[PDB]
Amino acid sequence: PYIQERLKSLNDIETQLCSMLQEASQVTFIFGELKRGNESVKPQFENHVKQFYERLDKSTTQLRKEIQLLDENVGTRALGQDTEKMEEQLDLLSAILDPSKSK
């Protein structure tokens, strides 16, 4: 089905969230260097920092959006017996044809 697309959009939003983590983890160790007085990477600190904010805001819009979509999909509109019953024949019949002549 073509929803497998929307499914992959969310599984990727999932990787975005694991980035919210991965990114803010640097924010943790980098602010470690920063209050240690060694203003060495203060610009780099600012970078990965607005980056943790960025990843989660993108995730926030992306899954929030996905939820909006699912609500929209929701707004939008035994199977066993059917095909199986007939198809019986189709396989056995085609195979009975096959053993009668071939190649």
Binding site: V27, T60, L63, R64, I67, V74, S100
Partner: protein, 109 residues
């Protein structure tokens, strides 16, 4: 319905927003920020308890942040689940059956 389910997710997102900020801001207060200015309203006085703020921050903020994450990954994959919830036609065949019958059954004419 779907609405109520989402509300929760939105709340979780808001929670996730409000705690890396407390980890950052409380970092200031944890590092100790004793002010020559009298107006500033953060305290770190008593021994144990003011560095205890640092031990609580660790568990609180870091697990609230990571927790908002764990809950939000649940939220994500929950919606995923929600979405995964979801020949020889003719008498021609009469001929075929006759063929098989003569084939399997004996006699040579």
């Amino acid at each position: 319905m779907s609405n109520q389910a989402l509300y929760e997710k939105l709340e979780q997102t808001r929670t996730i927003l409000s705690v890396k900020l407390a980890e950052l801001i409380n970092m200031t207060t944890i590092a100790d920020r004793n002010d020559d200015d009298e107006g500033s309203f953060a305290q770190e006085n008593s021994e144990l308890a003011v560095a205890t703020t640092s031990v609580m921050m660790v568990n609180n903020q870091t697990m609230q942040l990571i927790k908002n994450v764990q809950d939000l990954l649940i939220l994500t994959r929950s919606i995923k689940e929600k979405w995964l919830l979801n020949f020889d036609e003719k008498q021609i065949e009469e001929l075929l059956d006759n063929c098989i019958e003569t084939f399997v059954a004996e006699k040579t004419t």
